[PDB]
Every structure is written in structure tokens, then in C-alpha cells.
């Protein structure tokens, strides 16, 4: 856990 | 005023001036109101890559932005740069913050331009690649809050002593030499730009974004072009 | 059979199988019947240039053929090479004659391919450039009547002692090493090919043309693929 | 004079 | 029967055949007994970099091996390659283990060759770059225990599942296409190669080394050339 | 006040200041009196080629000048450029005439510089290629009588309408952007430059020469540096 | 970090 | 071809 905020979409991987 | 053509990595949605309701990628032609956009899954905290291409045969400007192992976003727009930009221009990177902030760190940047006149193999080319930025980068013109040398990276906007980003900041970096982007008698003209960035944000939403742009040689940061204006436009028309 | 993708510089109009009523440029996908074509003002006697480009972002294959100081011809077609070609291929040049003839001389040839996986700067590249062809070009696979070393050029089809072209001839030249043209996990994949040619013809109409092609590694000249078949297809389906 | 045969088109120059 | 020219990254003192009494880098011309060596502070578990260059004007073969932050080991030798190698050769990487072992992992490999001849601006060039290695690398010739695919890397010798190196192992990797390394007519001929490596020894006692080599097109591993012979020479004369 | 490093194409024996008694090529370090020279069979009316190279590993500056079919004049000198030039410099071309004249026409110019640092695969590079020269070449700094546009070429000294060279003339051309020619951290630093020239003398009695040089960013033509001084040095010490 | 044997001496860096 | 002066000697080519 750390984060990618108000992120958007679908199937992706770079934690 | 200046003549801008840019590919923006917009992190905040200012629906009050065109922005879609989510972080997005976009192509801007002389206006902050993108001619075309695409959804983008920004990932606060990690290193991403942006690839930008254009050739005079298809006259199509396309961009790709992705994060290692995640999905990538693509945006394309048909445009004849010949009658939008002057034959000689300057290329650079711009970034800004405002109410909300984020770091706008450039870890590497490369550019390649090629022009072959109708005389054949008469190809003119320009190529530069930056993987390390020294404290005194004489081949770069720094405007606004831009600075180099820290960790060998290029920080486009203000960053505190500990690394915390600051609000209401703008800065750009343009390559020193003018670039011949198109010629009247050119069979083929093309260019490709690439750069890796790192956008980290402490507060709620990060803002405002980064953008690759091409402009008239003597271009400079418009007054008040902070925030939603990405240090590229004086107003939002 | 083989899997071909080619950009043909068709010099003779075989309207009996699709050809437009004039010399033309075209994009062929597994068939001699071009998916798209463009008019071409062939100039018997002088050196011309052909530029071919493709990138996985726009997934558009485009070609440009011109003569110094004359007008150029352009042809483009949207195609996702990923599901047309195998990930490993071979690239080469093909040419042929039949009832009518012409010389099919290649004066220079360069190729560049780049593949960057979703791991970032993980770019794989291949590049070769031929400006001189020796009598023993070990990095080329010659098929049919192809020969090198004469004047440092690559003659794809039969040429007499004095330089007169011969009828019913075919020959190709493929670069020796296999090429990785696309990868499953590739953010961006692109390639560009260029070559200068010299088509001279003694009789009425020159024929039959030259073509840049990509195929399965072990590809070879089909039987009877002379004439209208440009040494690429067994039949005209 | 030498030639470009059954040529095609418009405004061009490489004799 | 084989002509070999190589820059060896000797991680092992076989002082019984010439090796100095410490890890070193050296230049070999048709013999395992280096013409010139240079002390090398090899570093286990750390990624290193090797850079090899050569030009026909100076006729000097130079190599640099370094680790980030540490210093560099350098070695040079004056040799006219026109009198040592055939016109067409094949380039590659080799490594071996014997009584003692280490992993000989290659993380990336680049190579560029250029030849200019009796014609203004007339140059032939070959360039390839590997940052990722597929399980099925059709443009590489793997000999002995060499393999690819594991973490996108190229393992020159056996390593097992848990990543521990095996003794008495030998492997090589050569680029598929032959290379034109020189020619009488050539005005300026030069080449430069680069590769990053990771030599790890769990037992902590490295052997036997990695090497960059050039040889005749039909070269293959000599009998019992494991261990001190680095998979290059048949004997230690 | 200026630091100059240059390879001179001396078409004139000023045996009163060191020049051998025949046309030659030489390497100058802060003085017009070459450190090392080499007989050169200069050819009037014929296009020639100059190739200059240098790397930090060997620290040798080499140059080759040749004409198609004729032989090559070569010259090398061992010099560590880290102790002669500042970190940032500007590269360019210079030429002059005096009592006697010749045309100093440049038909093409290429340059490539590279720096690798304390980071695996971390390199900075600059590359530019000129085959055509526009009347308004904004990426070049023309000093003295230098001009561009005439036949797409770059005329370093005066030539008049009927193409006849003028005496007592001096001109230079420098690339606009500063160049990073070296750095302490650099593991491998190197550069190579190439240009084709046409030295013609109607009266048939050449003078004074052309030169490729590197200098501090703020360099300009010294007083009375026409003639034997090649527009580089203020005196002949 | 299994440091290691077969690596020369003089100037270094580590922990 | 105004041949020319300021060019050394030894091996050549011409007409
Ligand atoms: Ca916005
Ligand atoms: Ca046809
Ligand atoms: Ca050993
Ligand atoms: Ca002189
Ligand atoms: Mn926007
Ligand atoms: Mn057709
Ligand atoms: Mn040894
Ligand atoms: Mn001199």
C-alpha cells in the first residue's frame, strides 16, 4: 500500500 | 501571442473549461481546450513513460502514455503542423500547480527530428537524449520555477527541501537550439519525443499536470498561466 | 503457403486482375490484389526513393515514392500487422519481368525496427544500411536471379552483359537475420524502410515492378510467380 | 531528351 | 581451425597458464594467454558494464569495465584486425564454469559496426540492441548451455531453479547475421559493443569468466573448453 | 582568452611559422603551430571528406581526410581533453584566405557526442546532421564572411557571383547549442564529426585552409586572424 | 550481500 | 579541370 489516487480505469498492474 | 502545440498529461478535471470528468491525456492546438482527449489512469507515486510521434506523410499527431505493467492510454489527432507552426520552433516541457499540487519530475527526455528534402537522401537530423540532468545544464533554457541537478532529475515546479511539492507554481525547460520542424520542399518530415515522469501528490487530488510542447522560438511563460493553464496559455479560450 | 505483406511499385497495369489503368503504388496483404492504391508517375531512366513507415500506435502502414524535383505519390492503409504476420519475420525486396522488361536496380537500402515492451525503456532495436553491395554479400539471402556486386548495386532481375534487362525473370533479397516485428507485451512497435531504385526499360512498356515485403522466415519464390506476380504470389486470388 | 515512358501525371521535375 | 579475438572478463587466476594473481580483464588474440591485462575489482552480486571499441584509423582495441560508483578497469592493445580476422565474422558472448562456479547473466547487449568506402557519404552499418531476451530469440544462436527467457535475461551457463550456478558448464550466444568487420576499400571502419552483466557466486568464489568475442562465421564450442578456456580455445597454448 | 582545439586542413605552407613545405593536415592545441602534422595530397576541384574521432578511454584525437579513389592522409595525437577544454564548449568550422584564395565550401556536416555516467545504461547524447543548408539556418551561428543557402551549401569565405573566391576573407559556423564534451563522472565519453568539402582555386594556388574546431562557448573571430591564422588564433606563437 | 572473492583490491564502496 | 598547386605528391588518379 502507498497509492494511485483518484485513479481512473481498468485492468492494469504497476502497483 | 505565442503559437503552441502541446500534448498534455492533465491531472485535474476543470470541467469549467472543457476537461472531461477524469484525469486525461490530450492534444492541444493553440488552445487549452483539447481538440481530442483520452482517459488516463494516472498512478500517483510511480514512474511512467510518454511517447509522442508525428510524420508528414500521415499528418497525424499521436501519443502514448503508460506505466510498466498497467494499461496504456492513446490519443491521436489529424493535423497539418505546416500551417499551424512556423518552420522554426523550440521544443520543451511545461508543468504547473495551483490550489492542489503534485511533483512534476522528469527523469529522462529524448527527441529526434528528421527532414529529407526533395533531393533525396538529403536528410537533416537532430537528436538529443537526457538521462541525467546536471545542476548547470547549459543546453537547456529554464523558465519559471524549473531547476535541474537534484538527484540528476529535472524538477519543473517548486519542491520543498524534503521533497514536498508547492502550490501555484510553473516552470518549463526548452531545448537550447532552434528546431527545423518542417520545410516547404520536404518529401518526409517526422519527429518523436519520449520522456519518463514521476508525479507524486500529498493532498487530496494532484494537479495540474505536465505537457510536451512546441512553440515559436522566443516563447515564454504567460502571466498567471499557473494552475489549469499548464504554463502554456494566457487565458482559457 | 507463405504470409506476405508488401508495398508494390507496380509498373504495368494488369487490369485483368485488379490493377488500375496506370502505373501505381500499392499495399498488398496476402494477395496480389492491393487493398489500396495510388497513381504513380514512374520515370524510366532516373533514380527514385521509397520510404515506408508503420507504428503500432496508429496501426497505419504508409508509403511515399518520389523522384528528386518531381511530385511524390502516397498510399496508406489501416492494418493491425499483429494478426496478419507471425511475430518473427524476414524482410526483403522482390522484382520481376515477363513479356515486357525493365531493370530493377537497388542502389541503397536501410531498415530500422524498434520494440519497447511494457517495462519501459526496454527497447530492442535492429538497424542495417546498405549503400554499397559487394559481390559476396553474406548478410543477404539471394533468391531467383538476384545478384550483387555490379557497380556496387543490387540487381534483382536478370541483366545482360551490356545492361539490357531480360524477360521472364524473378529474384529477391531478404536480410539474413530474422526480425521481431511485434510482441504481445509491446507498448510501442515501429519500423521504417527506405531504398533508392533505378528502373530503365528499352521496349514499349516497362514491367513488372519492385516490392518491399515482409514474410515468414523460410519464404521462397513461388513457382511461376514471374510477371504480374512480382515473385510474391503463386496465383492472383 | 531520353525519357519517362507511358508516364502518368501532373506537375513534376526530375527530367 | 577457429580464429578468435576476445576481451575477457576473467574472474579467475589460473596462474599456471599466464593469468595474473587476481581478477582481471584482458585482450586475447588467438590464444587464452592475454596479450595485455589489467587488474579488475570484480564485484559479486553487482551489475556491471563492459564497453568495447575499435577503429581502423588508430587500430587500437580498447575496453572499459566498471560498476556504478566504483572505478574503472581499462585495457588497450594495438592490433590491426585486417591481418587477424577474415572479412566476414560473427560476434558474440561466451562464459564458463569448472571446479568453481558463478552465474554469467547478461542483462542487455548492444553492438554497432560501420564501414565507409570509396564514395563520399557511402557507409554500410549494422546495429542491434537487446534489453529484453525472449524465450525464443530467433535472431540469436545459442550454443552449449546458453539459454534465454528467464527474467528476460540471457543465462550463458547452467543455474538451476533456485538460481544457484552449476560447475563444469559452457555456453555462447552469437548474433544470427554475419558481420562485415573490414574491407580493403574502407576509409574508416569501426565498431563498439556494450553489455551489462551480473556475476554472482553464492559460495562466494567466482570462476571462470565471461567474454566478448569475434570469430569466423562457422565457430562452435571447442572440446573441453569449459573452465579456464572460457569456451573459446581448444588448448592453453 | 579563447581555448581552441582544432584539426586543420592547411592548404598552405607558411614555413615561417612551422608549416611543413607542402599541403598537410594537423592537430592544433591552443596554437597555430600544430603538435603533429601529416602530408596531404589536397585536390582542387574535387569533393573530399574529413573524419574526426576521439574517446576518453584512449584519449587520442584522430583525423582522416580522403578523396574518392585517392589515398588517405591520417594524423593522431595523444591528448587528454579534460585538461585543455572547459566542461561546456561549442563546436564548429572555420576557414580563411589572404594574399591567395580558394573557395571553402562545405557540402555536409555531421556530429555526435556521448557521455555515460555513474549509472548503468545512463548516457546523454547529442547528434546533428546537415546535408542541406537553408538561407536562414537558425541553428547555426555564422561569424565573419560565412553564409549559407547558395546551392544548399555553406560558404565559409567570400566567393562573389561568378563563383570566384576572394582574398583576405574569414568566416566561421558554430552549432547553436552548447555541447557537454566531458565530465569527471563520465565512464566513457566520445565524439565523432564528419564533413565533406570542396576547395577550388581558379588561379590554381590554394590558401589558406579549412578547420574543424572546439572552443569555449563565447568564442569569436580574433583580430586579423585571416590568412595563415585560419580565423582561430590571434597570433602565431 | 554475499560480498565475494574473485574481485581485485584498492578503492571501493559498500556496507 | 584546373588541376591545382597546394596539394602534396605520391599516389594519384586523373585525366
Ligand atoms: Ca485540467
Ligand atoms: Ca501489374
Ligand atoms: Ca581464468
Ligand atoms: Ca598555412
Ligand atoms: Mn485538459
Ligand atoms: Mn498492382
Ligand atoms: Mn586471463
Ligand atoms: Mn599548418
| Contact list, H13 vs chain F (CB under 8 Å) | 69-70
Q: How far is the CA of B198 from the centre of ligand 5 (A)?
A: 19
Alpha-carbon distances, residue B1 vs B175, B216, B222, C99, C136 (angstroms): 20, 9, 9, 63, 60
Is-contact E87 E75, C-beta < 8 A? no
In chain C, the domains with their CATH numbers are 1-237 (2.60.120.200)
Q: Do chains H and A touch (3 or more CB pairs under 8 A)?
A: no
Half-sphere exposure at residue F81, Cβ-oriented, CA atoms within 13 angstroms: 33
Residues 6+ apart with CB under 8 A from E37: E10, E20, E24, E25, E26, E75
Q: Do chains H and D touch (3 or more CB pairs under 8 A)?
A: no
Is-contact E206 G10, C-beta < 8 A? no
Q: Which of E49, E55, E118 sits opposite F120 (nearest CB)?
A: E49
User: For residue B125, what are the β-bridge partners?
Assistant: B114, F129
Residues 6+ apart with CB under 8 A from B17: B32, B33, B228, B236
Distance of CA B93 to the CA centre of its chain: 4
Helix, strand, coil in percent for chain E, rounding step 5 = 5, 45, 50
Q: Which of C22, C45, C68 sits opposite D8 (nearest CB)?
A: C22
Strand (E) or helix (H) holding F47: strand F47-55
Q: Which three cell numbers stand for residue D6?
A: 507511358
| Contact list, C187 vs chain B (CB under 8 Å) | 49, 51, 64, 66, 72
Q: Which three cell numbers stand for residue C49?
A: 526513393
DSSP state of B16: G
Q: Which three cell numbers stand for residue B74?
A: 492513446
Q: Which three cell numbers stand for residue E127?
A: 546495429
Q: Which chains touch B (3 or more CB pairs under 8 A)?
A: A, C, F
Residues 6+ apart with CB under 8 A from F177: B139, B175, B176, B177, F126, F139
Nearest ligand to the CA of C102 is 2
Q: How crowded is residue F224: how many other Cβ atoms within 10 Å of its Cβ?
A: 11
Contact C49 B119 (CB under 8 A): no
Q: Which three cell numbers stand for residue B188?
A: 518526409
Alpha-carbon distances, residue E56 vs B123, F53, F64, F113 (angstroms): 27, 11, 10, 19
Nearest ligand to the CA of C37 is 6
DSSP per residue, C122-136: -EEEEEEEES---SS
The candidate with the shortest Cα–Cα distance to B117, out of B214, B182, B179, is B182
Alpha-carbon distances, residue E93 vs E144, E230, F193 (angstroms): 12, 10, 30
Q: Does G10 touch chain E (CB under 8 A)?
A: yes
Is-contact C181 C214, C-beta < 8 A? yes
Contact C188 B64 (CB under 8 A): yes
Residues at Cβ < 5 Å from ligand 7 ion? E 10, 19
- What C28-31 contacts at long range (C-beta under 8 Å, 24+ apart), as own/partner pairs, is C28/C4, C28/C211, C28/C232, C29/C4, C29/C5, C29/C77, C29/C79, C29/C84, C30/C3, C30/C4, C30/C5, C30/C84, C31/C233, C31/C237
Greatest pairwise CA separation for chain C in angstroms: 56
Strand (E) or helix (H) holding H3: none
DSSP per residue, chain C: ----EEEEEE-S--GGGT--SS-EEEEEESSSS-SEEEE----TTSEEEEEEEEETTTTEEEEEEE-TTS--EEEEEE--GGGTS-SEEEEEEEEE-SSS----EEEEEEEEEEEEETTSS-EEEEEEEES---SS-TTEEEEET-EE-GGG-EE-S-B-SSS-B-SS-EEEEEESS-EE---TTEEEEEEEEEEEEE----SSS---EEEEEEE-TT--PPTT--GGGTTT-SS--
Q: Which three cell numbers stand for residue B149?
A: 541537478
List all residues of chain F from 94 to 153 with a beta carbon under 8 Å from chain E: 108, 116, 118-121
Nearest ligand to the CA of C228 is 2
Q: Which three cell numbers stand for residue B136?
A: 548547470
Contact E132 C124 (CB under 8 A): yes
Dist CA E42 CA E13 (whole Å): 13
3-class secondary-structure state, position E83: helix
Q: What are phi and psi of E65, to 5 degrees?
A: -130, 130
Q: Which three cell numbers stand for residue B148?
A: 535541474
Question: Quick check: bond before F200 cis, omega within 30?
Answer: no
Dist CA F40 CA B55 (whole Å): 44
Dist CA F31 CA F37 (whole Å): 13
Is-contact B211 B75, C-beta < 8 A? no
Q: In the PDB record, what is the listed experimental method?
A: X-ray
> Cell numbers 579534460 correspond to what residue?
F82
Q: How far apart are the first and last CA of chain D?
A: 8
Size of interface E-F (CB pairs under 8 A): 66
> Cell numbers 518526409 correspond to what residue?
B188
Alpha-carbon distances, residue C160 vs C102, C225, E139, F234 (angstroms): 12, 21, 37, 63
Q: Which of E60, E68, E120 sits opposite F120 (nearest CB)?
A: E68
Strand (E) or helix (H) holding B47: strand B47-55
- Residue E59 burial (C-beta neighbours within 10 Å; 0-12, 13-18, 19+): middle
Contact F57 E49 (CB under 8 A): no
Residues 6+ apart with CB under 8 A from E162: none
Is-contact E213 E30, C-beta < 8 A? no
Is-contact C231 C144, C-beta < 8 A? yes
Contact E125 C121 (CB under 8 A): no
Q: Which three cell numbers stand for residue B31?
A: 488552445
Residues 6+ apart with CB under 8 A from C59: C78, C79, C80, C81
Q: Which chains touch H (3 or more CB pairs under 8 A)?
A: F
Strand (E) or helix (H) holding E44: none
The phi-psi region of residue F184 (left if phi > 0; otherwise alpha if psi is between -120 and 50; otherwise beta) is: alpha
- Residue F199 burial (C-beta neighbours within 10 Å; 0-12, 13-18, 19+): buried
Contact E177 C139 (CB under 8 A): yes
Amino acid at each position: 500500500r502507498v497509492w494511485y489516487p483518484y485513479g481512473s480505469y481498468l485492468t492494469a498492474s504497476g502497483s | 501571442a505565442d503559437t503552441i502545440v502541446a500534448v498534455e498529461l492533465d491531472t485535474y478535471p476543470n470541467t469549467d473549461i472543457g476537461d472531461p470528468s477524469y484525469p486525461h491525456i490530450g492534444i492541444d492546438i493553440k488552445s487549452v481546450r483539447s481538440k481530442k482527449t483520452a482517459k488516463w489512469n494516472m498512478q500517483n507515486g510511480k514512474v511512467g513513460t510518454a511517447h509522442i510521434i508525428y510524420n508528414s506523410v500521415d499528418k497525424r499527431l499521436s501519443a502514448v502514455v503508460s506505466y510498466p505493467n498497467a494499461d496504456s492510454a492513446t490519443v491521436s489527432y489529424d493535423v497539418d503542423l505546416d500551417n499551424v507552426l512556423p518552420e522554426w520552433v523550440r521544443v520543451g516541457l511545461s508543468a504547473s500547480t495551483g490550489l492542489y499540487k503534485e511533483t512534476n519530475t522528469i527523469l529522462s527526455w529524448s527527441f529526434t527530428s528528421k527532414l529529407k528534402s526533395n533531393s533525396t537522401h538529403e536528410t537533416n537530423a537532430l537528436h538529443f537524449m537526457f538521462n541525467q540532468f546536471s545542476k548547470d545544464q547549459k543546453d537547456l533554457i529554464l523558465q519559471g520555477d524549473a531547476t535541474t541537478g537534484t538527484d540528476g532529475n529535472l524538477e519543473l515546479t517548486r519542491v520543498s527541501s524534503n521533497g514536498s511539492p508547492q502550490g501555484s507554481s510553473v516552470g518549463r525547460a526548452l531545448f537550447y537550439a532552434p528546431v527545423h520542424i518542417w520545410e516547404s520542399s520536404a518529401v518526409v518530415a517526422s519527429f518523436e519525443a519520449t520522456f519518463t515522469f514521476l508525479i507524486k501528490s500529498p493532498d487530496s487530488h494532484p494537479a495540474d499536470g505536465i505537457a510536451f510542447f512546441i512553440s515559436n522560438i522566443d516563447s515564454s511563460i504567460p502571466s498567471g498561466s499557473t494552475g489549469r493553464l499548464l504554463g502554456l496559455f494566457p487565458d482559457a479560450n
